[PDB]
Design a protein around this ligand. Structure first.
Ligand code: CLA
Ligand code: CLA
Ligand code: CLA
Ligand code: CLA
Ligand code: CLA
Ligand code: CLA
Ligand SMILES: CCCCCCCCCCCCCCCCCC(=O)OC[C@H](CO[C@@H]1O[C@H](CO)[C@H](O)[C@H](O)[C@H]1O)OC(=O)CCCCCCCCCCCCCCCCC
Ligand SMILES: CCCCCCCCCCCCCCCC(=O)OC[C@H](CO[C@@H]1O[C@H](CS(=O)(=O)O)[C@@H](O)[C@H](O)[C@H]1O)OC(=O)CCCCCCCCCCCCCCC
Ligand SMILES: CCCCCCCCCCCCCCCC(=O)OC[C@H](COP(=O)(O)OC[C@@H](O)CO)OC(=O)CCCCCCCCCCCCCCC
Ligand SMILES: CC1=C(/C=C/C(C)=C/C=C/C(C)=C/C=C/C=C(C)/C=C/C=C(C)/C=C/C2=C(C)CCCC2(C)C)C(C)(C)CCC1
Ligand SMILES: CC1=C(/C=C/C(C)=C/C=C/C(C)=C/C=C/C=C(C)/C=C/C=C(C)/C=C/C2=C(C)CCCC2(C)C)C(C)(C)CCC1
Ligand SMILES: [Fe+2]
Lengths: 37, 490, 32, 24, 25, 76, 188, 148, 36, 30, 118, 30, 31, 30
């Protein structure tokens, strides 16, 4: 596990790897917001 | 000009060449029927009808002559196993000749209608062009159809004037051609009743006459003239191809399932008789009929007919075959010579054992010997390194009852394994792989080959129904679509 | 289970945080 | 010794004797 | 069960309130 | 009229489909979580596969008497 | 169709991996993923479960009636296994061979006793527990582990358990299912 | 038909048999599975193998060098010696904290003597490997006079 | 018509469609059909 | 090696081969 | 028959049928056979009438002609009523890209599925 | 014997491939 | 609104959300 | 009944039969 001065922050760490899947999805939201111009 | 696949459509416009081109096909079909019946008579072996019958020898059209009364030959022999004192004119060779003589007569008629195509009958009055009155033409031919149907049913099948059809017992032992009586109750729709066949062709023959008189007189509706495209000779082709694959699924269906119109003495047993234990139960019903009245084992198994034990065999199952395992059933395992007995298995604790028979799916199947209650006690194991059900340790001996090995016991662990692997195939028989140089692996009966053709034909004729129904409804757009056809969108 | 619940709260605050940029920038301004 | 039913059960088990009336 | 219907009826009345929170605006 | 993009962007669509759509999801949730789906379709619950009579897979093995046999195989 | 609620958000009823069994005169904890086999290998089989995955992994209990009251009356543990050596099967290949590797001549299988014990329970009766590895010439499963345990009950009846596990499955977790079933075997 | 035959192998588990079965069940920790817990829990088994490791170094490794058997001297230094790094940490983790730095400092330079002996045995330099070995045995006795 | 933006509909509806799919992968590791 | 298959192969070649050659050389001369 | 041995042994050791990239490859060759029959029949069923019924319709196209020998609007306006109107491709260039991309991407996955089971 | 028939069917198929490439009916433009 | 286009979608969409509520509750049935 | 004579008869028919049919149907269409 993490060092024990950081183990309360371990719930945030389990969400951190999937974030670049949301970066490719954000390019589709931004292009949907300009209506795919 | 035309493509290769469109050459026969020169006949669609003139009815005289349509007579001539159906006459040539009819000369070839009956020319096949006589030629195949001459080929089958020239190779048929009528010596043993009990243990080498016609379906065992690859005879395909000989069980169709024998189904409608032709049982005798110009070589003296019959089917039931006796000498014909008067073969008559309607032998097998008389009918094989009557189709060849008809083949040449239909040949000459086709040459006539090809040259004399421009008959005045084919041109309708007051327009002068070639036309056919297809509602009345159907009414003529439906009238002749129900007249032959009633004639075949009341006279040929019923035995009023004709000979009759083949009728046997449930177990394929005692079968002859005898007349039937029509059965008009609910029993006439049981298709294993031969009386429903005679009761069919009378009732369907009378209705086909009455329907034929309708279509002779009552002209069709105009709304139903255009909607079914009655003025084309191809809307009758599409509906007739639809009629003949419907028929070919029914015909191949009743051949495969078995019916009174498909006897097992002519076409062989069905695959559902091996699966459902049809002959095995009756063989056990007759042993237990004799052990209950007071008799020995070897004196009860001798009372079973050798023909009944031959139906109880996996090699006469029509679904134990192959698509390119060609020829007779005798070419596979040999000509059956004699029933070799009934193998009964006992172990060293004096307990009877019963070989689990090979199911119809299995090309190979492990041999298992089960007890009375259904628990495996012995087998021929694949791994013999540390076994616990081997025949050698369990001590399986085999005794025969009836047949050629009656009252003979085998305790040799090599011999017992040989007959245990023959007992999963059914009753034990002795063959000869030298008379026809047999391969060693089974074939299918004519009951299986007829079914294979007549479902492959019934499925390819579904596509021909689809093609020719499409060419009538879409006759105007066959060569392409119009240039201004863009009005079909919003 | 608070360790599983905070992981869900951390998911929702981040999975919104991308479209939160896109929604807010669409409303005020609009140079996306 | 053996009924005709429990001779066609250990040999075929798809038998029309063994399949019908098999609620017992 | 009950808790599968309690939080179900919670958002049945929350989305009815939140659906009316913008319907009043 | 109404070509699939003035519906999804209309607010009257979502004053309907934010009420009927969750109440239909909950209706599907409660069809199974009240055990009614095990009763309507006759699928066995995870404590209903093996009674005390049999500890093996069922086998129907009888054509015309299957209706009361599957009642005996299920244990009712 | 009795209406019981589905187990939404509910606690499990069995994560032990063992099902308690009670036959006639004995009780043991069967491997929970195993199912009853309709096979009688041996004279005296009461139950015989096998694995769902492969039929090599199986157990069997055997209740022979005997004239003796204690398991020491059968002699010692070394003289006991040679009497009950039929549990390991018989070499059905009486062929002559010297080309199989790691075996005596004409032997295509060789059992090897690896462990004995003399454990008891809260009733006082001692057991004869065995642990073998039976190798074969083809060497299927990497060998086969045998877990033989035997005792005589309070009704002069010899109860013998034999758990057979293929060695391929043994190191992959079927030791926990077998030893947990083998230690749980108590004859009342 | 013959029965199977038994063999008295009840003492192979006492010697070495149930050792690859402990290294294959995935319920034990890997320190129990790799043999790491058992080396730390019993001090005398490390003290047996470390005195055995110098028996493989002080006597068994020079013999392959004067006859120039390189691939039997590269792997003499890895076969039974292949636990000595893990062993010399367990024997040095039983000392005082100013004695452990004296222990791990001597243990660190014996590592630098073996890794220099290995490279001498790698380019087949017999005049260097026979010289690097005498340095290696001196650094070996300095560690073993500290941790035991 | 145009009362709610279509891209915000397609984001939100697409999110709880991906969110519902993640429940189907969550339930594939726990409960029924989890092999434990 | 049978009498059937050696000549069924030759008839399935030559009867459709030459039929197509009858139609092609008819066409290629037009 | 050596190929067939290679397939049968592969499914025992790697379970290729339960692999999604082989599932996508089957979708590429079943889709690629559907779309070959679909695009192949809509073009054939939209041919402009250029020849008679005594000669094949394939004679109505000339190699190198610059006009376009079938009606794309009638083909699109037929598949539109068959399932849905916006479920079709009114763009023949966009039709032929999807016609290329469905087998090629599907076989790209089953080539990688075979290479991941490698 | 049948291997002679097998190679004749394989040589004959490779013959048609050779004629279909180098003796094809050439596409005339316009 | 009961038209053909309404009966086409809600023939599909109404049981789809009913089964998606059913299948989601099956993910939390433990045993 | 030999393998030679049954198929030498069939080849001496069909190879010159169809050759003459190739030349006739070529000619009768001209
Ligand atoms: C009148 C002359 C005549 C007679 C008496 C026979 C007699 C015989 N033929 Mg031959 N045959 C004839 C003409 C004749 N044939 C012609 C002209 C042809 C060329 C088409 C053939 C081609 C032929 C073949 C290919 C075969 C025979 C066979 C047979 C034998 C059995 C027939 C059988 O089982 O058919 C069964 C007949 C039917 C099941 C009839 C099918 C008709 C369907 C059911 C009716 C459906 C349409 C109907 C109009 C629906 C409306 C009904 C109602 C509403 C009106 C029998 C010896 C068989 C044989 O063993 O010969 C070696 C055989 O294989 N025949
Ligand atoms: C669907 C109709 C149908 C079918 C298929 C059969 C089929 C059969 N019947 Mg049955 N029958 C039927 C209807 C039918 N019957 C009807 C309606 C009656 C009542 C009239 C009978 C009454 C009847 C009797 C009484 C007998 C049969 C017999 C037969 C069998 C032999 C007939 C045969 O093969 O002729 C095949 C015929 C042809 C293929 C046509 C050949 C054409 C000839 C050769 C051309 C030349 C004609 C002439 C000789 C030349 C004249 C010269 C002139 C110009 C100068 C066969 C199983 C016989 C039988 O089974 O005995 C063993 C028998 O005795 N049938
Ligand atoms: C009281 C008088 C009477 C009696 C006793 C009979 C007795 C009989 N009739 Mg007849 N019949 C009569 C009057 C009578 N009929 C009259 C007045 C008519 C009107 C003209 C008919 C018309 C008629 C027809 C058209 C048929 C019979 C058939 C039968 C048989 C029924 C049992 C059978 O073989 O089933 C077997 C037949 C069926 C089970 C038919 C089912 C049809 C299936 C669905 C066709 C499947 C093909 C289809 C394309 C499906 C796709 C393929 C599939 C694999 C997916 C029996 C001989 C049938 C027959 O001869 O069978 C051999 C038959 O097909 N009868
Ligand atoms: C529906 C039609 C039909 C049916 C069911 C039968 C059924 C039967 N016939 Mg008969 N036969 C028929 C039509 C039919 N025949 C016709 C039209 C002829 C004239 C040519 C014959 C001539 C004939 C003879 C001379 C013999 C039989 C024999 C047999 C039996 C064995 C079947 C067999 O070996 O199949 C073989 C089946 C296959 C090989 C599968 C066919 C699958 C397709 C069609 C292959 C085609 C693919 C490809 C394009 C071919 C190119 C390959 C090339 C190398 C040739 C069986 C009872 C034999 C028998 O037992 O007689 C006693 C026998 O000696 N038949
Ligand atoms: C009662 C049955 C029947 C009849 C009378 C016709 C008649 C016709 N068809 Mg249709 N057709 C049928 C069944 C039938 N078909 C079936 C079952 C199918 C599905 C396979 C088709 C599929 C079909 C297509 C796709 C087309 C036709 C066309 C035609 C026309 C020209 C045929 C031609 O020139 O062939 C010429 C054939 C040859 C020169 C050689 C064919 C050789 C093959 C391999 C068969 C070998 C012959 C074999 C010995 C006989 C066994 C047949 C078996 C049923 C017993 C003609 C109107 C054409 C049409 O409509 O033109 C506008 C056309 O394009 N047919
Ligand atoms: C995929 C199947 C299929 C297709 C696309 C067609 C297509 C066509 N058929 Mg064909 N046809 C088929 C199957 C098919 N048919 C079958 C199986 C039969 C019975 C043999 C027929 C018999 C037939 C005839 C006799 C005629 C056509 C005609 C036509 C054309 C006009 C449309 C029509 O009336 O359809 C036919 C209508 C249907 C197939 C729909 C009927 C479906 C009903 C509602 C189902 C009833 C079954 C029942 C409820 C289930 C209980 C039994 C169950 C236990 C198995 C068209 C080309 C006509 C034509 O060519 O005109 C130019 C014409 O004359 N068809
Ligand atoms: C003009 C004439 C030339 C035309 C071309 C000739 C070749 C055409 C193609 C022929 C294909 C079949 C060749 C069989 C070769 C063979 O080994 O036969 C060899 C067999 C003979 O087989 C022999 O039989 C002997 C007994 O007489 C012995 O048992 C021998 O052991 C056995 O070898 O000949 C046949 O069986 C021909 C039967 C033809 C019909 C079979 C049933 C068909 C049903 C299906 C119909 C639809 C099929 C799907 C269509 C799509
Ligand atoms: C050895 C290979 C492997 C063996 C394969 C065996 C099976 C072969 C199957 C295919 C057979 C040929 C199919 C039809 C070809 C065709 O129509 O071409 C059409 C062209 C016409 O082109 C035109 O031909 C004109 C000449 S003329 O018009 O033909 O007189 C010419 O002037 C013009 O430039 C040109 O455009 O023909 C030619 O160019 C030359 C004539 C070809 C003669 C047929 C050859 C037959 C094969 C014999 C090979 C030896 C066999 C025995 C040894 C194994
Ligand atoms: C008496 C016993 C019976 C004798 C019968 C003997 C005659 C039988 C002749 C049948 C063959 C005729 C076929 C001509 C074939 C032919 O001429 O093609 C051309 C033809 C139509 O082309 P068109 O419409 O342009 O026609 C123009 C005209 O010139 C043609 O006459 O295409 C078809 O008819 C569809 C079927 C083609 C199928 C082509 C082969 C496809 C499969 C290829 C397999 C090998 C490659 C794949 C390997 C994996
Ligand atoms: C002139 C004349 C005559 C003669 C006649 C004759 C001689 C006839 C013959 C006829 C014949 C001799 C015929 C035959 C026929 C045959 C056929 C017609 C066959 C066919 C075949 C087929 C059709 C096949 C098919 C197929 C194939 C391809 C393979 C397999 C599958 C199938 C089956 C599909 C006389 C002298 C009497 C007198 C009078 C006149
Ligand atoms: C029921 C009956 C029967 C049957 C019958 C029949 C089936 C019949 C048929 C019949 C027929 C089916 C007939 C046919 C005929 C045909 C003809 C008669 C033809 C002719 C032709 C011609 C004459 C031609 C000529 C020519 C030539 C050669 C070339 C040049 C040109 C000309 C055109 C000139 C019997 C016997 C069983 C018994 C009695 C009753
Ligand atoms: Fe295209």
């Amino acid at each position: 596990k993490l060092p024990e001065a950081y183990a309360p922050f371990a719930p945030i760490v389990d969400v951190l790897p999937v974030i670049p899947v949301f970066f490719i999805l954000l390019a589709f939201v931004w292009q949907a917001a300009v209506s795919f111009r | 000009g035309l493509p290769w696949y469109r050459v026969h459509t020169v006949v669609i416009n003139d009815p005289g060449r349509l007579i001539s081109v159906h006459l040539m096909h009819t000369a070839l079909v009956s020319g096949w029927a006589g030629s195949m019946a001459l080929f089958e008579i020239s190779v048929f072996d009528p010596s043993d009808p009990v243990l080498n019958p016609m379906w065992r020898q690859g005879m395909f059209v000989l069980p169709f002559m024998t189904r409608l009364g032709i049982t005798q030959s110009w070589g003296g022999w019959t089917i039931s196993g006796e000498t014909a004192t008067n073969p008559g004119i309607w032998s097998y060779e008389g009918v094989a000749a009557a189709h060849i003589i008809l083949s040449g007569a239909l040949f000459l008629a086709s040459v006539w209608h090809w040259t004399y195509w421009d008959l005045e009958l084919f041109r309708d009055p007051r327009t002068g062009k070639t036309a056919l009155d297809l509602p009345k033409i159907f009414g003529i031919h439906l009238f002749l159809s129900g007249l032959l149907c009633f004639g075949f049913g009341a006279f040929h099948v019923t035995g009023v004037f004709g000979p009759g059809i083949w009728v046997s017992d449930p177990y394929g032992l005692t079968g002859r051609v005898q007349p039937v009586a029509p059965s008009w109750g609910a029993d006439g729709f049981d298709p294993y009743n031969p009386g429903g066949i005679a009761s069919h062709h009378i009732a369907a023959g009378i209705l086909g006459v009455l329907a034929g008189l309708f279509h002779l007189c009552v002209r069709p509706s105009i709304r139903l003239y255009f909607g079914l495209s009655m003025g084309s000779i191809e809307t009758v082709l599409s509906s007739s191809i639809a009629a003949v694959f419907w028929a070919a699924f029914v015909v191949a269906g009743t051949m495969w399932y078995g019916s009174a119109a498909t006897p097992i003495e002519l076409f062989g047993p069905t695959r559902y008789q091996w699966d459902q234990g049809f002959f095995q139960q009756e063989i056990q019903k007759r042993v237990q009929a004799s052990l209950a009245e007071g008799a020995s084992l070897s004196d009860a198994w001798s009372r079973i007919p050798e023909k009944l034990a031959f139906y109880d065999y996996i090699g006469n199952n029509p679904a134990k075959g192959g698509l390119f395992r060609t020829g007779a059933m005798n070419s596979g395992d040999g000509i059956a010579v004699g029933w070799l007995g009934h193998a009964s298995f006992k172990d060293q604790e004096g307990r009877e054992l019963f070989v689990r028979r090979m199911p119809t799916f299995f090309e190979t199947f492990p041999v298992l010997l089960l007890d009375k209650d259904g628990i495996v006690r012995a087998d021929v194991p694949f791994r013999k390194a540390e076994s616990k059900y081997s025949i050698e340790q369990v001590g399986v001996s085999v005794t025969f009852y009836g047949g050629e090995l009656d009252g003979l016991t085998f305790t040799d662990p090599a011999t017992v394994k040989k007959y245990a692997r023959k007992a999963q195939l059914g009753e034990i028989f002795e063959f000869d792989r030298s008379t026809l140089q047999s391969d060693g692996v089974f074939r299918s009966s004519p009951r299986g080959w007829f079914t294979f053709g007549h479902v492959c034909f019934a499925l390819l004729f579904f596509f021909g129904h689809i093609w020719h129904g499409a060419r009538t409804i879409f006759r105007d757009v066959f060569a392409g679509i119009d240039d201004d056809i863009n009005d079909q969108v919003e | 289970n608070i360790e599983l619940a905070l992981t869900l709260v951390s998911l929702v605050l981040v999975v919104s945080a991308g479209p939160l940029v896109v929604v807010l920038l669409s409303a005020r301004g609009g140079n996306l | 010794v053996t009924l005709a039913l429990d001779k066609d059960d250990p040999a075929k088990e798809d038998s029309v004797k063994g399949l019908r009336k098999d609620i017992n | 069960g009950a808790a599968g219907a309690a939080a179900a009826a919670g958002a049945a009345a929350a989305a009815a309130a939140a659906g009316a929170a913008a319907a009043a605006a | 009229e109404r070509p699939f993009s003035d519906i999804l962007t209309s607010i009257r669509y979502w004053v309907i489909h934010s009420i009927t759509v969750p109440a239909l999801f909950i209706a599907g949730w409660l069809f199974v979580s009240t055990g009614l789906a095990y009763d309507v379709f006759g699928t066995p619950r995870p404590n209903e596969y093996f009674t005390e009579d049999r500890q093996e897979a069922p086998l129907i093995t009888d054509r015309f008497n299957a209706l009361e046999q599957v009642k005996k195989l299920s244990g009712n | 169709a009795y209406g019981d609620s589905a187990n939404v958000f509910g606690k499990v009823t069995n994560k032990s991996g063992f099902v308690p069994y009670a036959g006639d005169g004995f009780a043991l904890l069967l491997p929970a993923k195993w199912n009853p086999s309709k096979e009688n290998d041996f004279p005296g089989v009461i139950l015989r479960y096998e694995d769902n995955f492969d039929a090599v992994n199986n157990l069997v209990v055997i209740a022979q009636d005997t004239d003796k009251k204690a398991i020491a009356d059968f002699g010692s543990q070394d003289k006991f296994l040679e009497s009950v050596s039929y549990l390991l099967g018989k070499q059905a290949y009486s062929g002559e061979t010297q080309s199989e590797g790691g075996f005596a001549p004409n032997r295509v299988s060789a059992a090897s006793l690896l462990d004995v014990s003399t454990t008891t329970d809260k009733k006082g009766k001692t057991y004869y527990k065995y642990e073998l590895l039976v190798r074969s010439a083809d060497g299927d499963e990497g060998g086969r582990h045998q877990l033989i345990g035997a005792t005589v009950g309070s009704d002069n009846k010899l109860y013998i358990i034999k758990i057979q596990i293929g060695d391929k499955r043994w190191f992959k977790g079927a030791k926990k299912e077998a030893m947990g079933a083998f230690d749980s075997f108590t004859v009342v | 038909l013959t029965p199977v035959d038994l063999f008295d192998d009840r003492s192979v588990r006492d010697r070495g048999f149930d050792l690859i079965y402990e290294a294959r069940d995935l319920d034990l920790p890997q320190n129990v599975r790799e043999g790491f817990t058992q080396a730390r829990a019993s001090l005398d088994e490390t003290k047996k193998r470390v005195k055995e490791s110098e028996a493989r170094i002080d006597a068994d490794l020079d013999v392959f060098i004067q006859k120039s058997y390189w691939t039997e001297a590269r792997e003499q230094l890895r076969r039974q010696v292949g636990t000595l790094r893990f062993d010399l940490n367990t024997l040095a983790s039983t000392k005082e904290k100013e004695a452990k730095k004296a222990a791990l400092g001597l243990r660190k330079e014996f590592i630098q003597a073996v890794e220099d002996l290995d490279f001498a045995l790698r380019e087949k330099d017999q005049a260097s490997a026979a010289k690097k070995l005498e340095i290696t045995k001196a650094k070996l006795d300095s560690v073993l006079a500290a941790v035991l | 018509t145009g009362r709610i933006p279509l891209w915000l509909v397609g984001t939100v509806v697409g999110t709880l469609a991906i969110g519902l799919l993640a429940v189907f992968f969550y339930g594939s590791y726990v409960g029924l059909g989890s092999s434990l | 090696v049978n009498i059937y298959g050696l000549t069924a192969t030759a008839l399935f070649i030559i009867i459709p081969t030459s039929f197509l050659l009858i139609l092609y050389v008819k066409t290629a001369s037009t | 028959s050596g190929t067939f041995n290679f397939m049968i042994v592969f499914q025992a050791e790697h379970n290729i049928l339960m692999h999604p990239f082989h599932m996508l490859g089957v979708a590429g060759v079943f889709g690629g056979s559907l779309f070959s029959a679909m695009h192949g029949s809509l073009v054939t069923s939209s041919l402009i009438r250029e020849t008679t019924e005594n000669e094949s319709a394939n004679e109505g196209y000339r190699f190198g002609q610059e006009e376009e020998t079938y009606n794309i609007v009638a083909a699109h306006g037929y598949f539109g009523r068959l399932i849905f109107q916006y479920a079709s491709f009114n763009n023949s260039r966009s039709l032929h890209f999807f016609l290329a991309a469905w087998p090629v991407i599907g076989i790209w996955f089953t080539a990688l599925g075979l290479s991941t089971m490698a | 014997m049948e291997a002679l028939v097998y190679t004749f069917l394989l040589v004959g198929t490779l013959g048609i491939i050779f004629f279909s490439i180098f003796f094809r009916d050439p596409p005339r433009m316009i | 609104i009961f038209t053909v286009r309404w009966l086409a979608i809600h023939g599909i969409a109404v049981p789809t959300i009913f089964f998606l509520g059913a299948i989601t509750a099956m993910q939390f049935i433990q045993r």
